[PDB]
Design a protein around this nucleic acid. Structure first.
Ligand SMILES: [K+]
Ligand SMILES: [K+]
Ligand SMILES: [K+]
Ligand SMILES: [K+]
Ligand SMILES: [Mg+2]
Ligand SMILES: [Mg+2]
Ligand SMILES: [Mg+2]
Ligand SMILES: [Mg+2]
Ligand SMILES: [Mg+2]
Ligand SMILES: [Mg+2]
Ligand SMILES: [Mg+2]
Ligand SMILES: [Mg+2]
Ligand SMILES: [Mg+2]
Ligand SMILES: [Mg+2]
Ligand SMILES: [Mg+2]
Ligand SMILES: [Mg+2]
Ligand SMILES: [Mg+2]
Lengths: 290, 193, 53, 98
RNA sequence: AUAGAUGAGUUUGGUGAUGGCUCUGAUUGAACACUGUCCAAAUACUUGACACAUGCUAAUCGAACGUUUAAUUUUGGCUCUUAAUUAAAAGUGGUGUACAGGUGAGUAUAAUAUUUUUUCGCUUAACUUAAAGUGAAGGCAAAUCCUUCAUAUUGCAAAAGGAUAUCUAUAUCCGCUUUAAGAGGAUGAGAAAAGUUUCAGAGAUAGGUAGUUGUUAAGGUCAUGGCUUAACAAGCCAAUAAUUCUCUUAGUCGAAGCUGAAAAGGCUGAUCGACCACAUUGGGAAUGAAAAAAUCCCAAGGCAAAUAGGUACAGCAGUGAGGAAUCUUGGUCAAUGGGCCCACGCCUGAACUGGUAACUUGGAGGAAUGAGACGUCGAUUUAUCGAGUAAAAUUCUGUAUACAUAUUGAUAAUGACAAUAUGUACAUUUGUCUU
């Protein structure tokens, strides 16, 4: 039963960015506006616009009520500590001066002096912001059906959900048929090779195959759902990327959920096609759903 | 695993076995084609044949297990039965010059007690001798002085289910009251009018 | 396939999982000894005295 | 009369039991004096064992159960069979060999 | 628990304040309207403690006891009449109906309540260990019923018998009485020291206490205390309501349910556990180790009954009524629990399971490709903008579910009903609100 919300799934007029590799979706992603118009809109009109844009991609197949409580105000992050710094300094120099360290001359004086002041001691890679706003939809990255789509085992989040519901996935060597299963750090999910080749392979064309009847490497086998010899789907390279909280092994179509997505200074691990301005309004919406 | 026990002189066939245990199980005497079918059919097979309600099927499976283990009812240890009738007689031994031990033994209806040998002079359990020349025990009807017969009877081994009198304790005074109303009302129709 | 194939313990204070409050209670087992002193129930010949043969 | 018995919990077609120390004449699921353990009747199977062998998980505080059996507690037939396997009491029933 | 604290519309000619109202968030044992495919779990008269047709929810032991007819077999007399066996049916006695289950009408509280530590006492049933004793009459048809006696460290104070084997009287089984312990307990006002208890709303009332407060003496008590008694003293508590009374409302409580960022938060007092009360209304006692009864006695009105003396579904299902509104007159004692029983076994509307309801929650309810059918439809800058990757079609999957097999819920044995696993097969709705 097709609901009213899925009619214009890849509308070229509305241009919604969906979690799939469809060619109509590639055009909507490439030609997306550099910045949505939020000049004269009110605070509600901005949060609703950001909520509609983001929810068109993140957890598209999950009800609004289920995600409303799946949303978490806890945005995890990490910091990089260089052993070379911690071995030479105990952090006292960071509390010099009046508690915040010594003062450096303003920028309009440094370059004036031909001699640059000695490098200030500090852990390398500091004074760079962390994109917390970009982690609004991190909880969705823990579902089994989503992790399968992020491992490049399926062409869409809905096709990966069918692999689970149809007993084609195996977590920790045990059959798992719940797409809402929340992976734990260390879980190893494995999909059937036959479903991955069809999901990511090219469509089976009879007209072109009809000409190839008789006229390492592989051969032809018309007794398989995908076109032989197996070749990658068209436009699959535009969506080819594996996040760092997964360790995929394509030889067996298996991956390990190493950890949860975290935000690092200057980087986020949640695949989202939206800017911090939109992810900041979506986060503000789900604080009180208004 | 499903070992079948050999029939006994007192329970030679299935119709006799179902007649003893009671619970109106002799109705299904035709479901079991042979003695080996009774002790071989399973719960699911007894259910298809139509052995119901579940109370009768579970009751049958229970007595089926007792027969295997040898936990017969009364008279099951007999050894000289004919057409379902067994005769019990008394055997007297001189335990001392001033005493005498009497035992209820089962012997053929013709041979005398003293004539039978120790091998065939079976001693039935559950039956004793009261005083002299009197056999006491369930279903022991007297035939003559010092003799009693034990015939196969319906429900001889049955675990009789308990029954209520006037509907039990809660509905005792009411069933008797309403019953008393029906009595008086009847007399009026007979002599009143 | 099991996550316990290779044991890599996590460093301390690296997770902040919030366990949910469990509803309900269990009966508190009664105390069998007094809170002070050594009772006569744990002596050498106690059982043989209160449960002779 | 103290008894070591089972309190049926769980859901429809999902039985789960508590081994408890309760007075005989009380409700089955009323709060007992103590909860000595749990008992799951449905046998489970090891995750990565393809041999087909099954097992039953039973948590029991043997030290606390021995004290109640020592003071005169009467375990039910089901709890008796469990206590006989661990090696506290003698079985009440056995498979006839003949 | 360290992330948890937020606003919006609306008074004025206008501005800033004050102060309500409404919306924004979450939820319900909900109801109604428009709708609705399947599955699981959970919940399901919130109102009239209103009235109830019918079947069931507490029975069990013949190894406590004789009666009663039935046949069977034996005596005397010549069908009747003795003494027995056997089977049934009512009973007598033992235990249990002091548990389980149901309801919230009444009930307005600080109390011989309660926590901690120290010190204690009582316990004639049942459970666990052990010891000793288990004789003699009478009454009922008989008895392990009732009455009574002997004996039981001194002297007062107990008991009950039944059943099964062995031999060419002995030994056992199940009980009974007493005693010493363990456990349990609803136990004694236990006591002392230091604490705790958010005690509904409104109104009135200044006295209350008469072993009452203290002393002496005595008794009682494990001990303490007018706990008890005699003789003296006139005290003790309170003064802002101690005490008493009227009206209104209500079962109490818990992270039990809902809710807030939070407050000794607020609200509720369903399902779960604890406690209290009640069993048509009112007035009562006995039995028992203990009232802890849906028991018993009595009165009244309703129904039934009249020469009787039952009944009250707030036990399960069900009916009528009331109401916006809440379901089956199923199966099984297989599992768990309980009563009776030497044992086997019997009973269990407790319980477990099938049914009804979108009431709630959880899950399924389909994925990928789809470009010139050079077709259709609606707007309209009649040539632009849309329906539209939408459809058709193509390639796959086999989800709820159906069927089959196996295992499992259960073992000494017992499966009412169903779960899980595996294999094969199937592509099935839109609805509703707003602008
Ligand atoms: K009761
Ligand atoms: K009430
Ligand atoms: K009812
Ligand atoms: K049962
Ligand atoms: Mg003015
Ligand atoms: Mg009600
Ligand atoms: Mg209540
Ligand atoms: Mg005697
Ligand atoms: Mg103190
Ligand atoms: Mg006094
Ligand atoms: Mg009330
Ligand atoms: Mg009534
Ligand atoms: Mg009506
Ligand atoms: Mg039982
Ligand atoms: Mg028994
Ligand atoms: Mg299936
Ligand atoms: Mg049974």
């Amino acid at each position: 039963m097709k609901i009213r919300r899925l009619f214009k799934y890849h509308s070229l007029k509305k241009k919604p960015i969906r979690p799939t590799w469809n060619k109509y979706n590639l055009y909507n992603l490439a030609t997306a506006g550099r910045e949505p118009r939020i000049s004269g809109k009110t605070f509600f009109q901005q949060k609703w616009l950001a909520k509609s844009l983001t929810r068109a991609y993140h957890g598209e197949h999950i009800k609004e009520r289920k995600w409303a409580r799946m949303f978490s105000r806890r945005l995890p992050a990490v910091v990089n500590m260089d052993p070379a710094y911690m071995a030479k300094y105990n952090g006292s120099e960071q509390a010099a001066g009046r508690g915040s360290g010594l003062s450096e001359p303003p920028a309009y004086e440094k370059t004036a002096d031909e001699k640059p002041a000695k490098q200030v001691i500090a852990n390398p890679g500091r004074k760079v912001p962390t994109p917390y706003e970009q982690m609004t939809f991190a909880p969705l990255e823990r579902r089994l059906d989503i992790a399968i789509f992020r491992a490049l085992f399926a062409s869409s989040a809905r096709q990966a959900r069918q692999m689970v519901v149809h007993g084609a996935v195996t977590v920790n060597g045990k059959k798992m048929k719940h797409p809402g299963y929340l992976l734990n750090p260390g879980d190893l999910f494995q999909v059937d090779v036959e479903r991955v080749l069809y999901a990511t392979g090219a469509p089976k064309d009879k007209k072109l195959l009809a000409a190839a009847m008789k006229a390492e490497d592989n051969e032809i086998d018309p007794s398989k759902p995908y076109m032989t010899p197996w070749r990658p789907r068209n436009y699959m390279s535009a969506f080819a990327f594996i996040p760092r909280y997964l360790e995929v092994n394509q030889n067996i179509c298996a991956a390990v959920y190493l950890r949860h997505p975290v935000a690092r200074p200057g980087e986020s691990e949640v695949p989202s096609p939206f800017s911090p301005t939109i992810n900041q309004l979506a986060f503000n919406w789900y604080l009180r759903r208004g | 695993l499903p070992l079948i026990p050999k029939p006994t002189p007192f329970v030679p066939d299935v119709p006799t076995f179902l007649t003893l245990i009671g619970r109106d199980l002799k109705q299904h005497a035709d479901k079991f084609p042979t003695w080996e079918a009774l002790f071989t059919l399973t719960t699911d097979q007894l259910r298809e044949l139509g052995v119901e309600p579940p109370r009768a099927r579970r009751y049958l499976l229970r007595w089926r297990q007792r027969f295997r283990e040898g936990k017969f009812g009364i008279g099951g240890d007999l050894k000289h039965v004919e057409n379902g009738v067994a005769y019990l007689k008394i055997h007297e031994k001189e335990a001392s010059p001033t005493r005498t031990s009497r035992r209820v033994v089962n012997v053929p209806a013709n041979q005398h007690v003293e004539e039978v040998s120790e091998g065939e002079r079976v001693k039935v359990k559950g039956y004793k001798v009261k005083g002299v020349s009197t056999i006491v025990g369930p279903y022991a009807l007297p035939v003559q002085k010092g003799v009693a017969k034990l015939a196969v009877t319906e429900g001889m081994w049955e675990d009789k289910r308990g029954h209520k009198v006037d509907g039990g304790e809660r509905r005792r005074a009411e069933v008797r009251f309403k019953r008393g109303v029906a009595e008086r009302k009847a007399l009026r129709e007979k002599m009143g009018f | 396939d099991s996550p316990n194939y290779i044991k890599v313990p996590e460093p301390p204070q690296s997770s902040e999982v919030r366990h949910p409050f469990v509803k309900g209670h269990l009966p508190i087992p009664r105390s069998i000894f007094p809170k002070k002193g050594v009772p006569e129930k744990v002596q050498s010949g106690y059982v043989n005295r209160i449960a002779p043969k | 009369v103290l008894k070591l018995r089972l309190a049926r919990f769980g859901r429809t077609n999902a039985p789960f039991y508590n081994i408890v120390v309760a007075h005989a004449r009380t409700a089955r699921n009323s709060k007992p004096l103590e909860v000595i353990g749990t008992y799951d009747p449905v046998p489970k199977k090891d995750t990565y064992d393809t041999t087909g062998k099954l097992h039953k998980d039973i948590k029991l505080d043997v030290t606390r159960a021995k004290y109640w059996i020592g003071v005169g507690a009467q375990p039910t037939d089901t709890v008796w069979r469990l206590l006989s396997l661990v090696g506290i009491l003698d079985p009440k029933y056995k498979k006839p060999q003949p």
